[model samples]
Target: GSARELDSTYEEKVNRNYSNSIFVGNLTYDSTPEDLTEFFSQIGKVVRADIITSRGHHRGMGTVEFTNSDDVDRAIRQYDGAFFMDRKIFVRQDN
Candidate 1:
């Protein structure tokens, strides 16, 4: 039956390159994308940083994309469980 083939096309599309990105949690309310970039730049080249927000309020989490996966590894190793902006932060690979 064609039903099996239809299931394959039903999956959502996502950028596989995001494998080079990391998720940052426990961010400060006032944290900005620039802050993330500057902080993570110490580990490697930061491609971009996004501050998750809702109606102009920070969500206390964000994602940072690096130039390569190596940088992502470095970021996770050095920054996970580290403090930033007076708050403890957790870093992990972006799923």
Candidate 2:
């Protein structure tokens, strides 16, 4: 399902039920899992979170997994073009 989601064209993807996870990019090195969680936590319940770090620090990119698919959809709809920490945040179905 994850693999298929990546290949899916937004138009071809009529069904919106994809993975309940998202990739947040354009983050800062100081960003933390807790911080990201806090921001996204407003949207829904976060089940798992992993902030990719470099040299033991945040790398301006991370993956966030929501507990429910519906919640993921809502977040994407609301914050798809929003910005965080002075950078644009991108939300998408993650594989």
Candidate 3:
């Protein structure tokens, strides 16, 4: 494939919606779904925690779904670049 670069001129700044899901990044290799749920649940009811994994190992990212869109916003504002497992992580709305 030819080399390519992302076009960021029109990048969105916010995506608050009824989807109620947030993308998390910079996770530790051993952070578990249970741990994710516990952390995000403090902001709202975590309906699902989809930890991204490859071949049985954590991929340092995942998506967390909450019961309400407000909770999604809350999670992003509260956890973006916050410490998790002693490591800073990014949290933002997922679509």
Candidate 4:
């Protein structure tokens, strides 16, 4: 069983620790976890990459988790607003 909302502090803690995770948007329609993993790996080691989907298709946005804060920062600096698959992708801290 769980409490009503799981407490606001829990949410704050999760958001506060986004140092190793980032949100990427404007992704290619055909982008996959593998593609993101490979693409972001160019900057640093990616722990995991995930793209939100509805009805089994990418939604042009996703999140990637790097192994460390340094890598996350580098990836953000290097890939934010970078063109990919004919579109400009936006990258930023997960917030």
All candidates' lDDT scores?
0.77, 0.74, 0.75, 0.77
Residues 1-95, candidate 2: write the lDDT tens digits: 34644344444445656777888776665677887788788886887778755566536778888888776777778777666777777765776
Q: Give the true-structure RMSD of model 4.
A: 12.2
TM-score, prediction 1? 0.71
TM-score of each: 0.71, 0.69, 0.71, 0.70
Scored against the true structure, residue 85 in model 4 reaches a CA lDDT of 85
The per-candidate count of clashes, in order, stands at: 0, 1, 0, 0
Candidate 4 wrong stretches, greater than 4 Å:
1-18, 52-54
Better of 2 and 4 by TM-score: 4
lDDT (tens digit, per residue) of candidate 1 on 1-95: 34545333456653444467788778686888899898888875898999856677647888888888665775677777777878988876767
lDDT of 1 at 54: 62
Which 10 consecutive residues of model 3 have the lowest summed lDDT?
Answer: 8-17
The true-structure Cα RMSD of candidate 3 reads 10.7
State model 4's lDDT.
0.77
What C-alpha root-mean-square deviation, in Å, does candidate 1 show against the real structure?
9.8
Scored by lDDT, model 1 comes in at 0.77
Model 3 clash pairs are none
lDDT of 3 by residue, 1-95 (tens): 76775665555465435676778778776777788898889875998897756576548887888888675686677677778778888776666
Global Cα RMSD, each model:
9.8, 11.3, 10.7, 12.2
